[PDB]
Amino acid sequence: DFCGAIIPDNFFPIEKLRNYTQMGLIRDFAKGSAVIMPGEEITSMIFLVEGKIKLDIIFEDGSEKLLYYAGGNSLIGKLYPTGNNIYATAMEPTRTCWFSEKSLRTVFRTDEDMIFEIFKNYLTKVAYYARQVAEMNTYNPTIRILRLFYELCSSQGKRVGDTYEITMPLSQKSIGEITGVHHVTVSRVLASLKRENILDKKKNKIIVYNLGELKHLSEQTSYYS
Amino acid sequence: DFCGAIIPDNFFPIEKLRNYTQMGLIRDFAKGSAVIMPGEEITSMIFLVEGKIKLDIIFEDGSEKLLYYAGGNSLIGKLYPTGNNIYATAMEPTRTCWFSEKSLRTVFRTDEDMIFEIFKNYLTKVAYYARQVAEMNTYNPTIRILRLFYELCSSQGKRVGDTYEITMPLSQKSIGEITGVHHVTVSRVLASLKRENILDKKKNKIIVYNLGELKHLSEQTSYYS
DNA sequence: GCATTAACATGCC
DNA sequence: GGCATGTTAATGC
DNA sequence: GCATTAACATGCC
DNA sequence: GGCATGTTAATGC
Ligand SMILES: O=C(O)Cc1ccc(O)c(Cl)c1
Ligand SMILES: O=C(O)Cc1ccc(O)c(Cl)c1
Numbered sequence: 001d002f003c004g005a006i007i008p009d010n011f012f013p014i015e016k017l018r019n020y021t022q023m024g025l026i027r028d029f030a031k032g033s034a035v036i037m038p039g040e041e042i043t044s045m046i047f048l049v050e051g052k053i054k055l056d057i058i059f060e061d062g063s064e065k066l067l068y069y070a071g072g073n074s075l076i077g078k079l080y081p082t083g084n085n086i087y088a089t090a091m092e093p094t095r096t097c098w099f100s101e102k103s104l105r106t107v108f109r110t111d112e113d114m115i116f117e118i119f120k121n122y123l124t125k126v127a128y129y130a131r132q133v134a135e136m137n138t139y140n141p142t143i144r145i146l147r148l149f150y151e152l153c154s155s156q157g158k159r160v161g162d163t164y165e166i167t168m169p170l171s172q173k174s175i176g177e178i179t180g181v182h183h184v185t186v187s188r189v190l191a192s193l194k195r196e197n198i199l200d201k202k203k204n205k206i207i208v209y210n211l212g213e214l215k216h217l218s219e220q221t222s223y224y225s
Numbered sequence: 226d227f228c229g230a231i232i233p234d235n236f237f238p239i240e241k242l243r244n245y246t247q248m249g250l251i252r253d254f255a256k257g258s259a260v261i262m263p264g265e266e267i268t269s270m271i272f273l274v275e276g277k278i279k280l281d282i283i284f285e286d287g288s289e290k291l292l293y294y295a296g297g298n299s300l301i302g303k304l305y306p307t308g309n310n311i312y313a314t315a316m317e318p319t320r321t322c323w324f325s326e327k328s329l330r331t332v333f334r335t336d337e338d339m340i341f342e343i344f345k346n347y348l349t350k351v352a353y354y355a356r357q358v359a360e361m362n363t364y365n366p367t368i369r370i371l372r373l374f375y376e377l378c379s380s381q382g383k384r385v386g387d388t389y390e391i392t393m394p395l396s397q398k399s400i401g402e403i404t405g406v407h408h409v410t411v412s413r414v415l416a417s418l419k420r421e422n423i424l425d426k427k428k429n430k431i432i433v434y435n436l437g438e439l440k441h442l443s444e445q446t447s448y449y450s
Numbered sequence: 451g452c453a454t455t456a457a458c459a460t461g462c463c
Numbered sequence: 464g465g466c467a468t469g470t471t472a473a474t475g476c
Numbered sequence: 477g478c479a480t481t482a483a484c485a486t487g488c489c
Numbered sequence: 490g491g492c493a494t495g496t497t498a499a500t501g502c
Contacts, residue, residue, distance in 0.1 A: 004308035077351065080348055398469085
């Protein structure tokens with residue numbers, strides 16, 4: 001029914017795969033440990049039973065960038081070699097379940113629906129990243145930040161009297177990483193939005209005091225203002 | 226064994242799915258016709274038996290951008306709604322095969338390997354677009370153009386005496402669309418590369434006269450030179 | 451560091 | 464011959 | 477239009 | 490208390 005993500009965190013979780021972790025291999029990591037080491041070739045799907053993984057790509061010159069965050073019931077779909085150098089670290093004590101190709105056949109023979117759940121999980125990732133490429137080719141950095149707050153507000157902002165609240169803990173550093181904008185530009189833009197009384201990004205909530213202005217500004221070509 | 230793409234054209238073709246098009250629905254399009262209309266909700270996988278599709282996303286303000294090109298044995302993995310407005314046009318007379326969820330079950334009951342072929346096709350797309358996001362966040366437009374020619378040369382350039390040839394018909398307009406660089410910047414960069422005798426992009430071949438210089442320049446922060 | 455604009459020139463079922 | 468692709472330099476976001 | 481740099485200030489298992 | 494996150498303005502790619 002719907003394969004969408006506004007942010008690259010907890011893409012299409014598959015809670016029913018917890019009924020089949022006995023067909024796969026349990027593997028616990030300590031906080032701070034590598035689930036996937038730089039240069040490690042992975043050929044398993046990795047189901048996250050409990051915890052939190054940060055998953056990054058590393059370029060040849062050593063540059064490192066965020067791809068996504070993974071939480072409980074997330075799926076790392078690295079069953080085959082891809083050409084990318086991936087580094088995935090446990091942000092907390094984390095339980096995984098490693099599903100090889102053979103082990104997946106065993107799961108599908110028991111439950112043919114899990115096939116389509118995995119397709120949904122992949123589709124969601126492709127829809128996210130393909131749009132993000134096209135969005136970066138269409139809107140300027142500062143506009144992409146406004147567009148993110150508008151879309152989170154539309155999709156998950158709760159009306160609370162005069163305002164909308166987005167119940168979400170989200171740092172400026174991550175906003176920058178997700179939107180591809182320098183963290184100092186992120187600080188500047190939020191300063192503006194705050195002092196103009198449009199939006200306040202707090203520790204655990206973003207509060208939108210003025211959605212129609214937020215939206216209007218997101219429709220311009222810059223908000224380096 | 227390998228889920229890679231340097232360019233968003235002909236991602237992981239699955240030639241064996243042509244053995245199962247009788248389980249799905251044949252649908253022929255004329256050149257210039259919409260395979261997916263703007264705003265059309267698609268819930269089928271669409272296998273391209275013969276021809277060529279150009280597949281674009283359209284934003285709310287009407288901006289339109291390339292996602293990818295599809296050729297024979299390519300797969301459009303839109304089995305479920307995604308939230309994106311997609312517009313896909315037949316660039317030539319094109320035969321498709323539409324596979325619903327029910328129809329895919331029928332295919333998998335006959336050949337369990339087709340499951341994993343589809344996973345490979347999805348993985349390849351996710352690896353492409355996820356890297357492209359991270360690359361646009363890491364390298365400047367002009368550098369991304371150099372990096373593309375270097376990687377195509379590495380991956381598919383054939384040594385021909387003094388040179389490498391990449392046997393590929395690729396317009397400046399598409400290079401721009403793929404790399405997210407204005408077509409006039411693309412023209413400028415190629416002018417430079419040509420007159421410095423590094424590389425010549427012709428109608429049906431790119432010729433690299435100097436791979437080590439190409440590579441060296443791709444390692445700098447700009448080539449607006 | 452490059453997008454944009456503009457005015458112009460060459461390619462092409 | 465008409466519309467799509469490519470060219471070059473200047474201006475400032 | 478914004479990344480970068482820099483020098484500084486506030487947050488935090 | 491130490492290292493990570495956030496702040497603000499200036500400079501020019
Ligand atoms: O491994 C890669 O190159 C990309 C990637 C990373 C994480 C995932 O869950 C997927 Cl499906 C792909
Ligand atoms: O439909 C989308 O939002 C993205 C998309 C487009 C084409 C494909 O083949 C896939 Cl797998 C996804």
